[PDB]
Amino acid sequence: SSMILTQFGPFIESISGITDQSNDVFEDAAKAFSMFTRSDVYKALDEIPFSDDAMLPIPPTIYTKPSHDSYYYIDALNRVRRKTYQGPDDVYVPNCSIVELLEPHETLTSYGRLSEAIENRAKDGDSQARIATTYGRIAESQARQIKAPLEKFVLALLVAEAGGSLYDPVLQKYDEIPDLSHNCPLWCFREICRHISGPLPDRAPYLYLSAGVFWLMSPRMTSAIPPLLSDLVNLAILQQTAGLDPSLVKLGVQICLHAAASSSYSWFILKTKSIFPQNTLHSMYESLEGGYCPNLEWLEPRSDYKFMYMGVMPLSAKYARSAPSNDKKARELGEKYGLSSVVGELRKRTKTYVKHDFASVRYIRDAMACTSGIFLVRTPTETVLQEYTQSPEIKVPIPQKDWTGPIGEIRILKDTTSSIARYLYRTWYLAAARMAAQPRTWDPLFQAIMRSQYVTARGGSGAALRESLYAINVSLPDFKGLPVKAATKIFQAAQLANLPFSHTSVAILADTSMGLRNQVQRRPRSIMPLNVPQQQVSAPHTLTADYINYHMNLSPTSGSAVIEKVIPLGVYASSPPNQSINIDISACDASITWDFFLSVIMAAIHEGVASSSIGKPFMGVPASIVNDESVVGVRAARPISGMQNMIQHLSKLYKRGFSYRVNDSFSPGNDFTHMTTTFPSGSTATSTEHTANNSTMMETFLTVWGPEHTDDPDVLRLMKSLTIQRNYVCQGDDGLMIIDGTTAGKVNSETIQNDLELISKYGEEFGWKYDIAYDGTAEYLKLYFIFGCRIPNLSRHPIVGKERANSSAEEPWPAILDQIMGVFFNGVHDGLQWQRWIRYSWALCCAFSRQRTMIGESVGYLQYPMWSFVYWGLPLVKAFGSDPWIFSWYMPTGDLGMYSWISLIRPLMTRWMVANGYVTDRCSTVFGNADYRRCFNELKLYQGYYMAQLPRNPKEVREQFTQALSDYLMQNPELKSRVLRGRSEWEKYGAGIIHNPPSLFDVPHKWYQGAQEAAIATREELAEMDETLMRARRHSYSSFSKLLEAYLLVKWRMCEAREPSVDLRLPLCAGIDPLNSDPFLKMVSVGPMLQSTRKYFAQTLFMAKTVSGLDVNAIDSALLRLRTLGADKKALTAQLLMVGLQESEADALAGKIMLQDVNTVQLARVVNLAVPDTWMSLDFDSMFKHHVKLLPKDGRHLNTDIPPRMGWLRAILRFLGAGMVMTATGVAVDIYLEDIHGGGRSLGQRFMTWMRQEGR
């Protein structure tokens, strides 16, 4: 587009599939991005001839806003607070003016920052100023919840889109996605800003800075503008990259405009966030007339989460939505927030989809992408006062007479009790007893593991611990002079290392420092991190909880990535005839208190643990004596174990309540301690504890309470057919009730409704407010599912958004590159339109690839070559004269991906290099007569390759510290003896074979390092990181990594396309349909991954877990490598002794490893090959097994044979073949090993040389 087209022309065509990509053009584009002034971006927006359809009414009230002053007040405790007007929730940042509170910036005369006078006036205690400073700071924070300046994302979008529609290589046609002249979000962005800038030359409404913000000194500017603008940019990009229906998009813009027009953007979004899902996802198929859905079989044991696809299930009226209607509630919500037209339109459109197919799920997805993606912001004071103020209402308390006399801090719940607690007790008691009876529980290694679990870089309320400890004349070492972040539990461990449990006991009752983390479409999450002594004492609670979750219920241990959220379960649960009820325990932490749960649990554990832990200490805590008034009248001193001693001290804290130290950085004068019964979120027990209570209560309801509260035959039948071991999956406060159907169709809806109401009333009995949703849909762990189809929720993954809870400065460049790559991978997982997405990412990466350096008056520039992004996982569009778009986003990362795209066009590269003067007389085994060495250096391919592999983070008291950490870990003498034995044994049988021996003695240094890396980098350190970068770009190379040079000796032949693994009319992931060719064909050919990835990979390790500080994958690599390198069994035994194992287990596991048939994935680690994250949603196990043939297409070749003792090659070879198959755009294809240059024998030695050389 003239200005844009003129400056990025060549780059635009190279990322559109018209021209080859080249570092020169990439870097010219990078220089262009960095020289583009901010206001020029807005001038570029001016050149776009917007269409009438991209316009909508912009509420004038968005620009004229009231003073912040009437929105705050000072409370009884003199804390600056938010003044409520629209309800209990109306506590976020208010939509007010801001200019009157700023002082012009020195150089940027049209921008201003919060008045320095107002802040000092506030610092000395003025009431009016404290209010203005709070508002100023909180509004700012709200404006900082992004990764970088919006202009970067917009500029990149303009550059990417100037390339016009993209030609799909498989469909053989251009996409019909509307150009920017039809992008309403972008049009709004331009108008809003233009209206605000008016005559001012500066076009930006605010400037995003490393730690703050400056606002354009316009009376038309508002605190609500940054969030609004941020939503608009995301929508603008998604409409072009997810091909979102432009008409649905305009609705989302309306909602945002209304949020800006209101008195509080963040509050408004919070109240209306359900609009799109409720009126689409939750109201689909009121009339089902056809289509297909998956037919999965849930394998046994159900706890393995392994499913098998059996075909499609023809849909008909039989399966039409039967869940309760929500039309009334939905419409009431709209009317209440001035959005009835939007709700009405959405409801009307939803009724038109009468078939369940790609079109309909894509419709839902599109609608759900329009929701605001801002990270809601409010002051910590507000979050603390709202999430820790109310207790649960126990409608049927545990009778006081049902407790015995005390046994120290606890009381036993009599068995004669009639309370529901009886059951919560039996379950925890049982579990405690079995947990404690396990021989492993008493193994020193296991206890070192439990003690290292919380020894991390994260904070542990260090300040309060030192204060509570200081209060008893117990001073802790200061380690004066150590460059480590003291505010880390690692540091805490070092300080406590040589003190008996008795000296730190009081620390168990010390205050807890509140942390914070903002969320999209949700209130802020509070972070209450316990201290080391507290965590230590929490072990019994945590262990018993794990036991329950491992042996007694159906639960998961998911993270935050889609790859680990058991996608298959949702598919199953949402496929008719099956049905699922989404159940949640609202205000879970505030509902697990002493009055009911904790007093019961502490008692059940304290007793269930008694006989097996009898006369032993535990994890450093000694046995003791407690006052026993258990038996009526009698009063003795009963001996208790170390384990019991812990529970005993823990009960005192749980019983007392918690003290949260609130340090509101945004509200001057708001420093206070808050006492509450609300449970800590940063305890090793939190999550697992809640998971166990969740299932225990659900089990009690299905077994006892429910049956006793109804005689309804149907409800009694439903109940009886459910079991917490088969039909209820839960994690923390989230639960999914899976009601399997029958041949007679699905279970009666009315019958389910009665069951749910019973469940609801049941919870009120013990203070739990269940949040039940029965809507024809499944929602578990933040993934949405309808009729067996996953609906990615794009609104939850803001492209420009970023969580910044505190006021610290953003991470220094180039951390942003890691985030931008993180943005790209989200697109791959969420199924955006592959070509539009790849092109956009390239524009985005290019726009951040350059950084300006000032080395004392000397001006320079850091520049990552385009090739670094490839190494990071970004597929090429077109190179070395190839066809465009032949590379898929499933191209592996690092060496495996480099090997894949190179092998795919190897002949091409050779031909191109020669054609361009890069020729030699020496014959390369890979590139023939091409002078590749000189080519890759000139094109910066080597430079980019090695630069990408550099860490993007600047890098006598030391001996004391490390030694302290060592005493902490090696506390138990028996454990140390094991490690020493391993060492002497190692010198005899393993030394020399490998140089990577993992060892507990390494942990102290591993921890120290982590405590160092946690500290904030120094100016010099940052400068050294840059120099390291420039050095790598200036150096000249002659080859890739040793591993990649070895993979390149392997050649393949791609043959017949695989037959479909799953029906082509079957929706598995909305957005991933015949309109998104590459992802759809890969999904169809390769097939979805039908098992929990956590359970799959747990089968690829010899040892599930180890001490925090060592890598289970590394240990598995050391063992397998020793085996490959011909080491003796005793060497593997030595290696296992060095990580804590007892000689007995050591010798056995070793002998087991020596004879085991290691499968592809696990063995592949001997050479650091990992299954790519992007592949986790597909059936990669099958690809490695049945579709990568290692027997040449036409028989056996001398070079392709596998030597007798190198069968481990097959594993490696499988990855290489799979790499190429997955990297090639289109249907997964069958690939056949064709050749190994120097033969399999030579190849093996080559990898063995690499195996034995690691870290010399």
Side-chain angles (χ1 to χ4, degrees), residues 698-709:
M698 187 54 63
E699 202 273 2
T700 294
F701 163 84
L702 295 174
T703 299
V704 186
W705 202 93
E708 300 181 332
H709 283 278

PDB file of all heavy atoms in Angstrom, residues 698-709:
ATOM      1  N   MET A 698     -18.022 -36.002  46.002  1.00  0.00           N
ATOM      2  CA  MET A 698     -18.867 -36.433  44.883  1.00  0.00           C
ATOM      3  C   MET A 698     -19.181 -37.911  45.053  1.00  0.00           C
ATOM      4  O   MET A 698     -20.277 -38.373  44.741  1.00  0.00           O
ATOM      5  CB  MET A 698     -18.167 -36.191  43.535  1.00  0.00           C
ATOM      6  CG  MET A 698     -19.042 -36.462  42.323  1.00  0.00           C
ATOM      7  SD  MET A 698     -20.626 -35.559  42.334  1.00  0.00           S
ATOM      8  CE  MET A 698     -20.048 -33.826  42.265  1.00  0.00           C
ATOM      9  N   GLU A 699     -18.210 -38.651  45.563  1.00  0.00           N
ATOM     10  CA  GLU A 699     -18.400 -40.073  45.786  1.00  0.00           C
ATOM     11  C   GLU A 699     -19.474 -40.282  46.867  1.00  0.00           C
ATOM     12  O   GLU A 699     -20.373 -41.100  46.704  1.00  0.00           O
ATOM     13  CB  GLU A 699     -17.072 -40.696  46.206  1.00  0.00           C
ATOM     14  CG  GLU A 699     -16.977 -42.168  45.962  1.00  0.00           C
ATOM     15  CD  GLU A 699     -17.507 -42.990  47.098  1.00  0.00           C
ATOM     16  OE1 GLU A 699     -17.995 -42.398  48.090  1.00  0.00           O
ATOM     17  OE2 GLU A 699     -17.428 -44.238  46.998  1.00  0.00           O
ATOM     18  N   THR A 700     -19.379 -39.517  47.953  1.00  0.00           N
ATOM     19  CA  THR A 700     -20.319 -39.596  49.064  1.00  0.00           C
ATOM     20  C   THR A 700     -21.741 -39.289  48.611  1.00  0.00           C
ATOM     21  O   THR A 700     -22.704 -39.892  49.093  1.00  0.00           O
ATOM     22  CB  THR A 700     -19.930 -38.601  50.173  1.00  0.00           C
ATOM     23  OG1 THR A 700     -18.673 -38.990  50.740  1.00  0.00           O
ATOM     24  CG2 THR A 700     -20.983 -38.563  51.251  1.00  0.00           C
ATOM     25  N   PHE A 701     -21.869 -38.337  47.694  1.00  0.00           N
ATOM     26  CA  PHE A 701     -23.174 -37.965  47.170  1.00  0.00           C
ATOM     27  C   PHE A 701     -23.778 -39.099  46.335  1.00  0.00           C
ATOM     28  O   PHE A 701     -24.956 -39.423  46.471  1.00  0.00           O
ATOM     29  CB  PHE A 701     -23.074 -36.723  46.287  1.00  0.00           C
ATOM     30  CG  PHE A 701     -24.278 -36.523  45.413  1.00  0.00           C
ATOM     31  CD1 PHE A 701     -25.413 -35.889  45.907  1.00  0.00           C
ATOM     32  CD2 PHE A 701     -24.315 -37.066  44.130  1.00  0.00           C
ATOM     33  CE1 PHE A 701     -26.572 -35.801  45.142  1.00  0.00           C
ATOM     34  CE2 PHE A 701     -25.463 -36.987  43.356  1.00  0.00           C
ATOM     35  CZ  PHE A 701     -26.599 -36.354  43.865  1.00  0.00           C
ATOM     36  N   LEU A 702     -22.972 -39.688  45.462  1.00  0.00           N
ATOM     37  CA  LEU A 702     -23.447 -40.769  44.600  1.00  0.00           C
ATOM     38  C   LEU A 702     -23.724 -42.058  45.356  1.00  0.00           C
ATOM     39  O   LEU A 702     -24.579 -42.841  44.959  1.00  0.00           O
ATOM     40  CB  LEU A 702     -22.433 -41.041  43.491  1.00  0.00           C
ATOM     41  CG  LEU A 702     -22.214 -39.923  42.473  1.00  0.00           C
ATOM     42  CD1 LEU A 702     -21.078 -40.280  41.527  1.00  0.00           C
ATOM     43  CD2 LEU A 702     -23.509 -39.701  41.714  1.00  0.00           C
ATOM     44  N   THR A 703     -23.004 -42.270  46.450  1.00  0.00           N
ATOM     45  CA  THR A 703     -23.159 -43.477  47.240  1.00  0.00           C
ATOM     46  C   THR A 703     -24.159 -43.349  48.375  1.00  0.00           C
ATOM     47  O   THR A 703     -24.997 -44.230  48.586  1.00  0.00           O
ATOM     48  CB  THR A 703     -21.809 -43.904  47.874  1.00  0.00           C
ATOM     49  OG1 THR A 703     -20.860 -44.183  46.840  1.00  0.00           O
ATOM     50  CG2 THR A 703     -21.985 -45.167  48.733  1.00  0.00           C
ATOM     51  N   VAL A 704     -24.083 -42.242  49.098  1.00  0.00           N
ATOM     52  CA  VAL A 704     -24.929 -42.058  50.259  1.00  0.00           C
ATOM     53  C   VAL A 704     -26.027 -41.010  50.205  1.00  0.00           C
ATOM     54  O   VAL A 704     -27.211 -41.335  50.111  1.00  0.00           O
ATOM     55  CB  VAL A 704     -24.036 -41.759  51.495  1.00  0.00           C
ATOM     56  CG1 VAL A 704     -24.883 -41.714  52.771  1.00  0.00           C
ATOM     57  CG2 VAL A 704     -22.927 -42.812  51.602  1.00  0.00           C
ATOM     58  N   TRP A 705     -25.631 -39.748  50.290  1.00  0.00           N
ATOM     59  CA  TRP A 705     -26.584 -38.646  50.326  1.00  0.00           C
ATOM     60  C   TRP A 705     -27.649 -38.679  49.230  1.00  0.00           C
ATOM     61  O   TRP A 705     -28.845 -38.613  49.520  1.00  0.00           O
ATOM     62  CB  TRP A 705     -25.828 -37.320  50.298  1.00  0.00           C
ATOM     63  CG  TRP A 705     -26.599 -36.175  50.840  1.00  0.00           C
ATOM     64  CD1 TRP A 705     -26.579 -35.709  52.120  1.00  0.00           C
ATOM     65  CD2 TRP A 705     -27.480 -35.309  50.110  1.00  0.00           C
ATOM     66  NE1 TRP A 705     -27.387 -34.597  52.237  1.00  0.00           N
ATOM     67  CE2 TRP A 705     -27.957 -34.333  51.018  1.00  0.00           C
ATOM     68  CE3 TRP A 705     -27.917 -35.264  48.779  1.00  0.00           C
ATOM     69  CZ2 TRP A 705     -28.847 -33.318  50.637  1.00  0.00           C
ATOM     70  CZ3 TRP A 705     -28.803 -34.254  48.398  1.00  0.00           C
ATOM     71  CH2 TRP A 705     -29.257 -33.296  49.326  1.00  0.00           C
ATOM     72  N   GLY A 706     -27.221 -38.783  47.978  1.00  0.00           N
ATOM     73  CA  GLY A 706     -28.175 -38.814  46.886  1.00  0.00           C
ATOM     74  C   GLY A 706     -29.242 -39.865  47.105  1.00  0.00           C
ATOM     75  O   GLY A 706     -30.419 -39.546  47.275  1.00  0.00           O
ATOM     76  N   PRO A 707     -28.861 -41.139  47.117  1.00  0.00           N
ATOM     77  CA  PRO A 707     -29.820 -42.224  47.321  1.00  0.00           C
ATOM     78  C   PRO A 707     -30.781 -42.021  48.508  1.00  0.00           C
ATOM     79  O   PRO A 707     -31.950 -42.412  48.439  1.00  0.00           O
ATOM     80  CB  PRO A 707     -28.914 -43.445  47.508  1.00  0.00           C
ATOM     81  CG  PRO A 707     -27.746 -43.125  46.641  1.00  0.00           C
ATOM     82  CD  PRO A 707     -27.496 -41.661  46.933  1.00  0.00           C
ATOM     83  N   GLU A 708     -30.292 -41.418  49.588  1.00  0.00           N
ATOM     84  CA  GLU A 708     -31.111 -41.195  50.777  1.00  0.00           C
ATOM     85  C   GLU A 708     -32.014 -39.978  50.661  1.00  0.00           C
ATOM     86  O   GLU A 708     -32.803 -39.694  51.569  1.00  0.00           O
ATOM     87  CB  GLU A 708     -30.230 -41.026  52.018  1.00  0.00           C
ATOM     88  CG  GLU A 708     -29.351 -42.218  52.344  1.00  0.00           C
ATOM     89  CD  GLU A 708     -28.505 -42.012  53.597  1.00  0.00           C
ATOM     90  OE1 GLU A 708     -28.177 -40.843  53.912  1.00  0.00           O
ATOM     91  OE2 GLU A 708     -28.151 -43.017  54.256  1.00  0.00           O
ATOM     92  N   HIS A 709     -31.918 -39.254  49.558  1.00  0.00           N
ATOM     93  CA  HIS A 709     -32.732 -38.068  49.419  1.00  0.00           C
ATOM     94  C   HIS A 709     -33.728 -38.102  48.280  1.00  0.00           C
ATOM     95  O   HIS A 709     -34.283 -37.076  47.900  1.00  0.00           O
ATOM     96  CB  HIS A 709     -31.820 -36.848  49.313  1.00  0.00           C
ATOM     97  CG  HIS A 709     -31.256 -36.428  50.628  1.00  0.00           C
ATOM     98  ND1 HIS A 709     -31.957 -35.644  51.518  1.00  0.00           N
ATOM     99  CD2 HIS A 709     -30.107 -36.772  51.254  1.00  0.00           C
ATOM    100  CE1 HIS A 709     -31.267 -35.524  52.636  1.00  0.00           C
ATOM    101  NE2 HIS A 709     -30.140 -36.200  52.503  1.00  0.00           N
TER     102      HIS A 709
END
